[PDB]
């Protein structure tokens, strides 16, 4: 694509520079180019890809929510709706781009639990972002696509990873947010976050000081949601 003439290692190096410069659109374009080189991604490289697009779509989601709120207040000219639609279309395009990378061909080449769960969690997340703005005939199919990706990731993580694994914990965190915010299943959300937290607590004794810090950090996010939800 646009990055076809740059070396893979240079794209990775520039993605790291872009992160330091808080240039997340550049970071995402560099990591998209790195993926399209066709080689599998290392653990660090998967994190760079995820951080880049999470930041980009995070800004789009925040803008979309501001404009949707203004739009709803007005419905109590066409410009607010038109501009919300513009931002919404741009967000959908980014989500489709990420889902395209996972489908061509990150997921099918990911055989290790850590990589496969990571990519399937991503797939659930970006379908969840599509679901946040969906209204029409595909809202249910988009929701089920998120659910299916999260569920496959959960099944693998429960079989292949310890209960304190940060990716396993963050997957459960986001799947619980999916249940609460998207699927209208707050009891499922609360149950998942509680069981995830409790099983991680019982496994903390196996960890080094650094792994303990990594796991307890995500466990606090589960606790924060439980405090909000109960």
């Amino acid at each position: 694509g646009a990055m076809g003439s740059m070396e893979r290692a240079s794209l990775i190096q520039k993605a790291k520079l872009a992160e330091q410069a808080e240039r997340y659109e550049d970071m995402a374009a560099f990591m998209k180019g790195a993926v399209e080189k066709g080689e599998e991604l290392s653990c660090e490289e998967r994190n760079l890809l995820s951080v880049a697009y999470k930041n980009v779509v995070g800004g789009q989601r925040a803008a979309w929510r501001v404009l949707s709120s203004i739009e709803q207040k007005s419905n109590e000219g066409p410009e607010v709706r038109e501009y919300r639609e513009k931002v919404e279309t741009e967000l959908q395009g980014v989500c489709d781009t990420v889902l395209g990378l996972l489908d061509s061909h990150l997921i099918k080449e990911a055989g290790d639990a850590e990589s496969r769960v990571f990519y399937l969690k991503m797939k659930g997340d970006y379908y969840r972002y599509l679901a946040e703005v969906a209204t029409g005939d595909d809202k249910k199919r988009i929701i089920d696509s998120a659910r299916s990706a999260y569920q496959e990731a959960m099944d693998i993580s429960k079989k292949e990873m310890p209960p304190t694994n940060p990716i396993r914990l963050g997957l459960a965190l986001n799947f619980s947010v999916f249940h609460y915010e998207i699927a209208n299943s707050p009891e499922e959300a609360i149950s998942l976050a509680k069981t995830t937290f409790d099983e991680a607590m019982a496994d903390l004794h196996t960890l080094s000081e650094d792994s303990y810090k990594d796991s307890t950090l995500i466990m606090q996010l589960l606790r924060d949601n439980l405090t909000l939800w109960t």
Binding site: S50, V51, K54, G58, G170, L221, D224, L228, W229
Partner: peptide, 9 residues
């Protein structure tokens, strides 16, 4: 409800 912040790495 907070998801993974995942904005820094």
């Amino acid at each position: 409800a907070g998801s993974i912040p995942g904005r820094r790495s």
